[PDB]
Amino acid sequence: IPTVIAYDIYSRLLKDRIIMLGSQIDDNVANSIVSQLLFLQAQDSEKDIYLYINSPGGSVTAGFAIYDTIQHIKPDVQTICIGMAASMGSFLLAAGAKGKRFALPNAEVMIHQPLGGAQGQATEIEIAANHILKTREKLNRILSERTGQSIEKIQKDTDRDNFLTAEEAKEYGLIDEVMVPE
Amino acid sequence: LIPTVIEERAYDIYSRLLKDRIIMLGSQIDDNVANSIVSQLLFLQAQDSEKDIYLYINSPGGSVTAGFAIYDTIQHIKPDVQTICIGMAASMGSFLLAAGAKGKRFALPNAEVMIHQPLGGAQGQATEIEIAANHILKTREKLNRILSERTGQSIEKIQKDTDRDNFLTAEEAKEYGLIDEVMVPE
Amino acid sequence: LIPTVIETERAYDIYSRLLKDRIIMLGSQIDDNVANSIVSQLLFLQAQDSEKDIYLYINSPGGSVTAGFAIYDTIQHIKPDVQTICIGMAASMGSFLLAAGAKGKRFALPNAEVMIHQPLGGAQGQATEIEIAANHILKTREKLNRILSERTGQSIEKIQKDTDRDNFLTAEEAKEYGLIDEVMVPE
Amino acid sequence: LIPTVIERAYDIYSRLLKDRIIMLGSQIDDNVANSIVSQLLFLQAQDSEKDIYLYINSPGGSVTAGFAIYDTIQHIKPDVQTICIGMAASMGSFLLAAGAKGKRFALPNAEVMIHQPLGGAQGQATEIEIAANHILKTREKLNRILSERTGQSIEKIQKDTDRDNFLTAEEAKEYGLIDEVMVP
Amino acid sequence: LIPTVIERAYDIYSRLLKDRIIMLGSQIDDNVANSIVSQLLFLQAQDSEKDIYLYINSPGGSVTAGFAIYDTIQHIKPDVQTICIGMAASMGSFLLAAGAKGKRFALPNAEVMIHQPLGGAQGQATEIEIAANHILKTREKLNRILSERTGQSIEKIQKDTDRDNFLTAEEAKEYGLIDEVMVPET
Amino acid sequence: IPTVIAYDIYSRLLKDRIIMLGSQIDDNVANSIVSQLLFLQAQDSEKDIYLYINSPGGSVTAGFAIYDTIQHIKPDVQTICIGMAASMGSFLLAAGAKGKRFALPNAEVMIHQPLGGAQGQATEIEIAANHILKTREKLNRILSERTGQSIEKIQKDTDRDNFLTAEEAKEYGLIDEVMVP
Amino acid sequence: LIPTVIETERAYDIYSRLLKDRIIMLGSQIDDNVANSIVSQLLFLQAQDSEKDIYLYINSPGGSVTAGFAIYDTIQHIKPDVQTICIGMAASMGSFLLAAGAKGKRFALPNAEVMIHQPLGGAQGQATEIEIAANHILKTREKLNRILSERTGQSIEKIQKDTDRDNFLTAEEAKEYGLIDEVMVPE
Amino acid sequence: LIPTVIERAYDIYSRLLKDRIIMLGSQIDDNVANSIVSQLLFLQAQDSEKDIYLYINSPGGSVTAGFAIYDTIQHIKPDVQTICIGMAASMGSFLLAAGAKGKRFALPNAEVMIHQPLGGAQGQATEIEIAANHILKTREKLNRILSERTGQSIEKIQKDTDRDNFLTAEEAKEYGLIDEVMVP
Amino acid sequence: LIPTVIRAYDIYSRLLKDRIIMLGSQIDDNVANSIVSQLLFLQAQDSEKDIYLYINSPGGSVTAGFAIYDTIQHIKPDVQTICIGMAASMGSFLLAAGAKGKRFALPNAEVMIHQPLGGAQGQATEIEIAANHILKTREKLNRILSERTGQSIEKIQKDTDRDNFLTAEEAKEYGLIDEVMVPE
Numbered sequence A: 001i002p003t004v005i006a007y008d009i010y011s012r013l014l015k016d017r018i019i020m021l022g023s024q025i026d027d028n029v030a031n032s033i034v035s036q037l038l039f040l041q042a043q044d045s046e047k048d049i050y051l052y053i054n055s056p057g058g059s060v061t062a063g064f065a066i067y068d069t070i071q072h073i074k075p076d077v078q079t080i081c082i083g084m085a086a087s088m089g090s091f092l093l094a095a096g097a098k099g100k101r102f103a104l105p106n107a108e109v110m111i112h113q114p115l116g117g118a119q120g121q122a123t124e125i126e127i128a129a130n131h132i133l134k135t136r137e138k139l140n141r142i143l144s145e146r147t148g149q150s151i152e153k154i155q156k157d158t159d160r161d162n163f164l165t166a167e168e169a170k171e172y173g174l175i176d177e178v179m180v181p182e
Numbered sequence B: 001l002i003p004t005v006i007e008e009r010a011y012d013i014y015s016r017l018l019k020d021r022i023i024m025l026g027s028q029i030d031d032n033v034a035n036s037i038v039s040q041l042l043f044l045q046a047q048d049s050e051k052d053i054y055l056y057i058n059s060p061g062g063s064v065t066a067g068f069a070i071y072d073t074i075q076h077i078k079p080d081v082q083t084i085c086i087g088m089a090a091s092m093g094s095f096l097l098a099a100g101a102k103g104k105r106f107a108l109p110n111a112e113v114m115i116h117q118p119l120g121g122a123q124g125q126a127t128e129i130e131i132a133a134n135h136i137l138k139t140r141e142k143l144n145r146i147l148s149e150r151t152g153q154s155i156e157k158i159q160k161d162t163d164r165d166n167f168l169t170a171e172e173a174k175e176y177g178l179i180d181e182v183m184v185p186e
Numbered sequence C, G: 001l002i003p004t005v006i007e008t009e010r011a012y013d014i015y016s017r018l019l020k021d022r023i024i025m026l027g028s029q030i031d032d033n034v035a036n037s038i039v040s041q042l043l044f045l046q047a048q049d050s051e052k053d054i055y056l057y058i059n060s061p062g063g064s065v066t067a068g069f070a071i072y073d074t075i076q077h078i079k080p081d082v083q084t085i086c087i088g089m090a091a092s093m094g095s096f097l098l099a100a101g102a103k104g105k106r107f108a109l110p111n112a113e114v115m116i117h118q119p120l121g122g123a124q125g126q127a128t129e130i131e132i133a134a135n136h137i138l139k140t141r142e143k144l145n146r147i148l149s150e151r152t153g154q155s156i157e158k159i160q161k162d163t164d165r166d167n168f169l170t171a172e173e174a175k176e177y178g179l180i181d182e183v184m185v186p187e
Numbered sequence D, H: 001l002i003p004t005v006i007e008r009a010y011d012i013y014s015r016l017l018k019d020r021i022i023m024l025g026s027q028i029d030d031n032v033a034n035s036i037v038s039q040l041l042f043l044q045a046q047d048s049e050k051d052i053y054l055y056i057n058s059p060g061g062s063v064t065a066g067f068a069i070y071d072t073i074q075h076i077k078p079d080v081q082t083i084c085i086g087m088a089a090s091m092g093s094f095l096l097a098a099g100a101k102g103k104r105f106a107l108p109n110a111e112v113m114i115h116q117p118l119g120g121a122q123g124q125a126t127e128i129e130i131a132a133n134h135i136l137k138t139r140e141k142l143n144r145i146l147s148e149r150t151g152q153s154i155e156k157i158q159k160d161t162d163r164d165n166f167l168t169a170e171e172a173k174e175y176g177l178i179d180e181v182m183v184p
Numbered sequence E: 001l002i003p004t005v006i007e008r009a010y011d012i013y014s015r016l017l018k019d020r021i022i023m024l025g026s027q028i029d030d031n032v033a034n035s036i037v038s039q040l041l042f043l044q045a046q047d048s049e050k051d052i053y054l055y056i057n058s059p060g061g062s063v064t065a066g067f068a069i070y071d072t073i074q075h076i077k078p079d080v081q082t083i084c085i086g087m088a089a090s091m092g093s094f095l096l097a098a099g100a101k102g103k104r105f106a107l108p109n110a111e112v113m114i115h116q117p118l119g120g121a122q123g124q125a126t127e128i129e130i131a132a133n134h135i136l137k138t139r140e141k142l143n144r145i146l147s148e149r150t151g152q153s154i155e156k157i158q159k160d161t162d163r164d165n166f167l168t169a170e171e172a173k174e175y176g177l178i179d180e181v182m183v184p185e186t
Numbered sequence F: 001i002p003t004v005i006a007y008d009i010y011s012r013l014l015k016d017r018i019i020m021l022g023s024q025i026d027d028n029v030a031n032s033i034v035s036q037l038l039f040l041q042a043q044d045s046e047k048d049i050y051l052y053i054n055s056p057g058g059s060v061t062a063g064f065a066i067y068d069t070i071q072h073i074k075p076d077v078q079t080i081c082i083g084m085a086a087s088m089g090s091f092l093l094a095a096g097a098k099g100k101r102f103a104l105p106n107a108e109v110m111i112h113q114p115l116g117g118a119q120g121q122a123t124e125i126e127i128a129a130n131h132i133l134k135t136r137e138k139l140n141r142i143l144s145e146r147t148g149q150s151i152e153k154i155q156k157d158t159d160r161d162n163f164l165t166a167e168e169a170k171e172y173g174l175i176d177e178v179m180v181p
Numbered sequence I: 001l002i003p004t005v006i007r008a009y010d011i012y013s014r015l016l017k018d019r020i021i022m023l024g025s026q027i028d029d030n031v032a033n034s035i036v037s038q039l040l041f042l043q044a045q046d047s048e049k050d051i052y053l054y055i056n057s058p059g060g061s062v063t064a065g066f067a068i069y070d071t072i073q074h075i076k077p078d079v080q081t082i083c084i085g086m087a088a089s090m091g092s093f094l095l096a097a098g099a100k101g102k103r104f105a106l107p108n109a110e111v112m113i114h115q116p117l118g119g120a121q122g123q124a125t126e127i128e129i130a131a132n133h134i135l136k137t138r139e140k141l142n143r144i145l146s147e148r149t150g151q152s153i154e155k156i157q158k159d160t161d162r163d164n165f166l167t168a169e170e171a172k173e174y175g176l177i178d179e180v181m182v183p184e
């Protein structure tokens, strides 16, 4: 990670209100991004924030930490998908400010149902199944609100792995514009 | 080392017991144990359709489907299959103990009987976890329904009493309806 | 430990004694070894008597599709009716072989579990290698679904839909589906 | 890499601590407890009157480490606000409920889970007995405090924590674990 | 390798079984219990009145597997003599004490050890509680029987089995675990 | 990593608009290079950027993160292959500014088809197969545009591992000139 | 992830800032490295001021007995009173050090856990080697129990009995026992 | 690959057992003790007067397993001759000395080793104490019996077994562990 | 692996019927126990007729080797030794131990001689005991080699200091064998 005159490259980007979601989403990544969003709001509550997304997703709860923080703060959080947005990464891509969700032409967007595990007694498995099913209902309802697609459509389209191009993601309502070279 | 006995005709001890219509369920229940026991049951009813069979149970249970292989074979064949719990009957072992011929389910005085929920697991997509959950819940309802029929307890009582690990003495198993008599020394 | 029995005085292991009365055991995961044994037993029994029925016990989670088709083709070629009986569970290629038994002689005991689902596999390497592997397993599924349609009387369209995910059936549901003919009830 | 901010260079979490914000964003072990307790002590010394803000995104962990944080919160003069962002499970949800009365929050999609303590024991029958009595007393201790913090009966807490019990933010408010669901 | 003897070929242990001698010469698990129980049942069927001789060189093991052997000994008509050779520890010493009254022996340098049951528990507090209650009940069951067969109080048995308690053959006789130290003919 | 008078060697190069792609391409490497590209264009949108490429390739999506960032920004991004460029590395070599794609005489260039895997149900294998086949068409279509070769020729020449010299890479259209001493 | 704090300027990591106000953290398993650090901090603080109290925070499951006695002996030698405060838990040699604080200045917060038990160890080899190891750990227990008796006011016989097995105590029970002087109740 | 002798077919060791020869040719564990004890019981039942021959090529092992064999040898009526061929170490040497008085042998290059018992202990101080007292009492037991078998004092045995003590066949005869060195 | 020949015999048991013993493996206690038992069986059948010891072995345990050695020297029958393939370490010692004038090797058979291998770990006095033991074992081996080859102890010491490979002809000249058996 190179230095620029004294900032590391990512910290220099943060000076211009740019946050990097460039890894698998766990609690540590969520804690950092939430802290960055809170800091940028405190500096200036009016100016836009830019969330770079190159992520395969990961933890749903960690994703919702980022999601809820985005929606609470006053500044518009722009989202731009560069490389790939999968699973909870694509959920956060769709969570960006209305009209300011982007993807570069060859960026990959994938949507699919949440993954999990359960082990032990029948009633413990039932509790785990009800939890992940309710979690999917929560994700689908919000994605419906964000994309303009129905919950029934999102349910069917996320049953298996569903890879989308940048243009297909725009047509779906996950992003607003495919950002072309000027 | 399984010992040999000579009656001339040499027998390993378990095969000698099988000659007198005795089957040993003395291990964890998997498909191999089920295949052996159902084959022994088929052989014995073919040899004699009237004479009782004796099923020894010292088992911590295991596979539910492997257990139901043994269960269904016991109920289909004409001979009464007596069950005797010696040492311990846990989980699907206690289910098979309760599945013996009415009036011929036994345990020795210090034998341990345990009943609880079916165990399992699932990993992957939410809909895959749902399928696994529905399957194991249906499997529990199936087991509890049969236990209710075999013991005379209500399905609601079986559900409550199998929620956690429930250890029973031989006398408690008799009171519950899992066995008919605690076998005492003469 | 497989127990021994004596017919008074020829000694047999329990499974060999069953084979004397035309009973073959499919009681494990289906691999090439299990297929070779079952194919050899079927060829032996039909050579002894081409008219008497053979009885195939099925307590199996399935396994290799090619090994399953070794057993399937042998069953269909030989003259004797091969009866099938599901005891415990028949999953995947085990349930396929359950449905492959002689017409009107496919059975399950009341608490036996039958599961149907699409074939499993894997592929790794170049895109064209993944394509070949994908085309192979899709063609294998169509092959399985077409034969299962013939044996059950259900459509290829229905079988495709019903085998998309793991589909557990009771013995009575398996009868309704056409995978078996009768649920064997106790007297 | 944790990002830096310069205005004096700060890592992002240390910059938040300057404005009386403490992060509980991991599994609770002794190291996390020692850090949070030290931060609370420091913030009390800096300003005994201004509120402290405890961010909670944690699956819980050690009960004793959790009680290190709990007791420090209750001792110090400043109110400690708690805010659940992402998820609060087990001892994390206990600490969420331990925030200053009227100042316990959760964001709308945050997850709260409550259940009984986990543990293990191995060896002699009397050694297993000691371990069982200890974890049972620890559960009574936790349930008694949770009853006081939520206003629910100990009997209800016992029943509701027997198995894994997932709650929405609104359900956590209705239960008494938090005071308000913070809306955008 | 187990040596063969020909009078009709026998492995050495099978030859001993012909004279009503059963070998408990290993750690007690379900397999060992299944074998010993089957041998006892076979010997009772052969002769319901002649004594059986149970050799014990064992560190113990499974309590439920031990109780399979224990209950089978007490049910059958023939007296089961017990002889400790080498060592009897834990459930091995319990079975030594379970022999027919007046027919429990040890050789002069044989080692007897008694202690409390060993086990484990993991998971939720209520699951640990169930596991703890179970092992405590199992110890009560063992101590009550040991009290009956030694003549010692349950209070004394509890205290003396709190830790590993090694006894000589002579101390085991004094305690009531055996009846006589079998001395060599000079 | 030595220091120079105070900059580490790679940071000193970044001051003269030089970016180093000297490793396997994963998301971390892509995030760093994308950030460096965005930094340099913000400093100066007119002056050229020099992308050093010594890489065996790696993730296709991580590669396309770098690719799209290069094409979007105003500055010409020169590409110089030193040592080796394989797979996605050779794709990024061909993605440099027109007339400013270079390789040193003994630099190695390799092209082949994308690598991947799939495991599970037949329909899951089908989805994975369709995805990687679409990814190959995407790569081959862009490589056809950058090199001037037909898609049918790219398909044939990338079927197996195809090693090229620097001069062969110039002939193929992957680079513009072999930079002589 | 240890946070930094700045005061107008001078930057400190949180634990170094606490050390500036004579606070030492025993917040881990006790090994030689932890003992070396704490002994060095104690020596530093007494050199800075021989009269002002030192505050020893204890959240520790214990560990090495010799490493514990390095801390114990340093505490007793230096002139300043070393206050001890149990927060979270003090087990084994951690609870021994809790009891070693200045008379009247040993504290615990209300929900802090205190545990006392026997020294743990092991030995493998010859009978005489096992004898040496046994005599050593027994002598170490006598040494620990004698000091505990002195600092708690309980008899050595009572300490022996109560430390035979794992003995968990509440903060209040630890006060009644004499391991601490006061439970710090919140205002 | 144990060779067959016809072859009436016999494996070589079973053929030797027909002429009252028992092989102690491995590490002594409970399995080896059970077999040897069973063979001794079989041979005395066949003939209580004729001698038994115990071949010893063993590094020893379990003390309790060794005492199973020891007590069985002393109880039965037949004289049990012992012959050390190759090596007798630890409990193997103890059983060599346990043979019938006047009928304990070794071949000229056979190795005899004596040393104190080995063991372990782990856990609480009182558990280590119990383990220590047990292994010490076992050493006293071994030394007392070895004193009876050899005619050497317990005090001498203690000192001579403090460390590993290798003896030649002639030195073992001088010690009283054997009676004669068998020459060609 | 081992084929049958027809009374049915496995190939090695058939060879034992004509007084042929196979030392075709690494020498451990199990191999020694079998070979000494075979030697005891053959001399019991006939004390006059020769025994033939096939040797294709890399050596191994010295004590297990001396179990075989002492048994060879004690019994009445001449034990012929023939090296086929290779005799290394204690295998070459046993090759030299064959009856005088009846020790053989085939033309391309390999014979290797070298000093004993071992290990020691622990206290200085424990290392001393182990060192004295293996040094005394070397003197024991070298003294017997000297007697059976005709070479001096000083020469055996020097020639076995490192690994010393010998041809069949060199082994004859050294005194380890009596003749290189030629094809007729």
Ligand SMILES: CC[C@H](C)[C@H]1C(=O)N(Cc2c3ccccc3cc3ccccc23)C[C@@H]2N(C(=O)NCCCC(F)(F)F)CCC(=O)N12
Pocket (backbone or CB within 6 Å): A034, A035, A038, A039, A040, A042, A043, A068, A069, A072, A073, D015, D016, D017, D019, D021, D022, D053, D054, D055, D083, D085
């Ligand atoms: C939108 C946040 C509110 C203003 C409110 C709040 O809800 N919260 C709760 C809250 C968090 C609290 C702690 C850690 C992360 C938090 C993230 C939040 C995200 C959304 C809403 C509230 C959050 C705290 C916030 N604080 C600051 O941001 N302080 C300024 C320091 C910022 C920086 F420069 F240090 F970065 C502390 C004081 C305060 O009232 N709030």
Ligand SMILES: CC[C@H](C)[C@H]1C(=O)N(Cc2c3ccccc3cc3ccccc23)C[C@@H]2N(C(=O)NCCCC(F)(F)F)CCC(=O)N12
Pocket (backbone or CB within 6 Å): B038, B039, B042, B043, B044, B046, B047, B072, B073, B076, B077, C017, C018, C019, C021, C023, C024, C055, C056, C057, C085, C087, C184
């Ligand atoms: C109760 C058995 C039925 C009468 C019926 C049957 O349902 N089945 C199906 C069936 C099984 C079939 C194969 C393997 C196991 C089986 C177990 C069954 C259990 C219950 C019911 C049927 C079973 C087969 C049975 N066979 C034998 O038992 N033959 C005698 C075998 C003797 C010996 F070999 F056992 F000695 C083959 C002929 C036959 O009609 N049946």
Ligand SMILES: CC[C@H](C)[C@H]1C(=O)N(Cc2c3ccccc3cc3ccccc23)C[C@@H]2N(C(=O)NCCCC(F)(F)F)CCC(=O)N12
Pocket (backbone or CB within 6 Å): C039, C040, C043, C044, C045, C047, C073, C074, C077, C078
């Ligand atoms: C149905 C069998 C056919 C008549 C034909 C055949 O197609 N085949 C081909 C064939 C197989 C050939 C080899 C191994 C397995 C085979 C399985 C087959 C299954 C179905 C059809 C042919 C099979 C061989 C068969 N053979 C035997 O069965 N011989 C008797 C074997 C008796 C015993 F050993 F079983 F007891 C050899 C002679 C022969 O003509 N055939």
Ligand SMILES: CC[C@H](C)[C@H]1C(=O)N(Cc2c3ccccc3cc3ccccc23)C[C@@H]2N(C(=O)NCCCC(F)(F)F)CCC(=O)N12
Pocket (backbone or CB within 6 Å): D037, D038, D041, D042, D043, D044, D045, D046, D071, D072, D075, D076, G017, G018, G019, G021, G023, G024, G055, G056, G057, G085, G087, G184
């Ligand atoms: C509420 C704190 C009390 C006033 C008291 C105390 O109870 N304790 C005990 C105590 C702790 C002691 C050490 C480490 C952590 C502690 C956490 C505590 C939590 C609650 C109560 C007491 C604690 C210590 C406190 N110290 C400081 O905080 N000093 C100020 C410097 C703080 C910083 F800036 F350095 F952070 C040292 C002097 C002192 O008397 N106390």
Ligand SMILES: CC[C@H](C)[C@H]1C(=O)N(Cc2c3ccccc3cc3ccccc23)C[C@@H]2N(C(=O)NCCCC(F)(F)F)CCC(=O)N12
Pocket (backbone or CB within 6 Å): B016, B017, B018, B020, B022, B023, B054, B055, B056, B084, B086, E037, E038, E041, E042, E043, E044, E045, E046, E071, E072, E075, E076
């Ligand atoms: C004490 C045995 C009872 C008489 C009764 C019984 O309670 N049981 C139950 C029972 C067991 C049953 C199966 C396996 C083990 C058993 C062990 C038992 C131990 C104690 C009491 C009953 C046991 C079975 C017994 N059987 C035999 O022993 N048959 C003789 C053949 C023995 C051998 F020679 F084959 F060994 C079968 C007939 C029968 O009625 N019983």
Ligand SMILES: CC[C@H](C)[C@H]1C(=O)N(Cc2c3ccccc3cc3ccccc23)C[C@@H]2N(C(=O)NCCCC(F)(F)F)CCC(=O)N12
Pocket (backbone or CB within 6 Å): A012, A013, A014, A016, A018, A019, A050, A051, A052, A080, A082, F034, F035, F038, F039, F040, F042, F068, F069, F072, F073
């Ligand atoms: C090409 C940049 C566009 C003009 C636009 C944009 O599309 N984006 C989106 C965008 C990214 C956003 C975040 C992180 C990486 C990004 C990479 C991009 C690559 C290509 C196109 C847009 C990118 C951001 C850009 N920002 C800066 O670069 N700001 C100054 C950067 C200075 C410094 F920090 F580097 F020093 C923030 C404001 C802004 O308008 N944009």
Ligand SMILES: CC[C@H](C)[C@H]1C(=O)N(Cc2c3ccccc3cc3ccccc23)C[C@@H]2N(C(=O)NCCCC(F)(F)F)CCC(=O)N12
Pocket (backbone or CB within 6 Å): G039, G040, G043, G044, G045, G047, G073, G074, G077, G078
């Ligand atoms: C109580 C200390 C004694 C007065 C004496 C001593 O016994 N010792 C021995 C002694 C130790 C010596 C070295 C390391 C640790 C020590 C810990 C001790 C604990 C108790 C008693 C003596 C110790 C050394 C002490 N030194 C300092 O502390 N020097 C001051 C520097 C302090 C700091 F700032 F550097 F920390 C060096 C000179 C000196 O005479 N002593």
Ligand SMILES: CC[C@H](C)[C@H]1C(=O)N(Cc2c3ccccc3cc3ccccc23)C[C@@H]2N(C(=O)NCCCC(F)(F)F)CCC(=O)N12
Pocket (backbone or CB within 6 Å): E015, E016, E017, E019, E021, E022, E053, E054, E055, E083, E085, H037, H038, H041, H042, H043, H045, H071, H072, H075, H076
């Ligand atoms: C010296 C043996 C005594 C006579 C006595 C005895 O003490 N015991 C106890 C005893 C053992 C008992 C069981 C197993 C092993 C035993 C080993 C013993 C060793 C020494 C002394 C008693 C032993 C049993 C002996 N039995 C036989 O040997 N029976 C003949 C069996 C011959 C054959 F099977 F080997 F061929 C069974 C009856 C019996 O009274 N005893």
Ligand SMILES: CC[C@H](C)[C@H]1C(=O)N(Cc2c3ccccc3cc3ccccc23)C[C@@H]2N(C(=O)NCCCC(F)(F)F)CCC(=O)N12
Pocket (backbone or CB within 6 Å): H015, H016, H017, H019, H021, H022, H053, H054, H055, H083, H085, I036, I037, I040, I041, I042, I044, I070, I071, I074, I075
């Ligand atoms: C040379 C052997 C002596 C004659 C003597 C003896 O020294 N010993 C001691 C001795 C051994 C004893 C047991 C096992 C192996 C032995 C190997 C020996 C090797 C050398 C010398 C004595 C050995 C035993 C020998 N026995 C037999 O060989 N019995 C016949 C065996 C026939 C058959 F089984 F082999 F076929 C038992 C009786 C006996 O007096 N001896």
